[PDB]
Design a protein around this ligand. Structure first.
Ligand code: FES
Length: 105
C-alpha cells in the first residue's frame, strides 16, 4: 500500500521560554535546537548528543521524534520531557525550554 508522509515538511515551532515566546519554522530533518540557533535564539546545550540534561524542555503540544536521544528514560519521554538537541518535529510543536532544573536522574 501507499505511503502517506511527505518527503519534506516545515513545522512551526513555538518555544515557551521562561519569560517569552519565540517561533520559527523547522524542517522535518532539523533538530529543534539547531533550528532555533539558526534563528539566533540562545538555547542551553552542552553535549549536543542526547546524553545530558542541558537542553531539556517539555512538550506542550504536537509530536516529536526523539529516537536520537538517550539520557531520558522511556517514562520521562512518555511524560513529555524533551532533549531539544536531539528532537525532530513531526508536526507543529510547542515546547517549554530551559527545563533542566525540573528533571531528576
Ligand atoms: S545538550 Fe546534552 S542532551 Fe542535549
Amino acid at each position: 500500500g501507499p505511503l502517506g508522509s511527505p518527503e519534506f515538511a516545515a513545522y512551526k515551532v513555538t518555544l515557551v521560554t521562561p519569560t517569552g515566546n519565540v517561533e520559527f519554522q523547522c524542517p522535518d530533518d532539523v533538530y529543534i535546537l539547531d533550528a532555533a540557533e539558526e534563528e539566533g535564539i540562545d538555547l542551553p546545550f552542552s553535549c549536543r548528543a542526547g546524553s545530558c540534561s542541558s537542553c531539556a524542555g517539555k512538550l506542550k503540544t504536537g509530536s516529536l521524534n526523539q529516537d536520537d536521544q538517550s539520557f531520558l528514560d522511556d517514562d520521562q519521554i512518555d511524560e513529555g520531557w524533551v532533549l531539544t538537541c536531539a528532537a525532530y518535529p513531526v508536526s507543529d510543536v510547542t515546547i517549554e525550554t530551559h527545563k533542566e532544573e525540573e528533571l531528576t536522574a
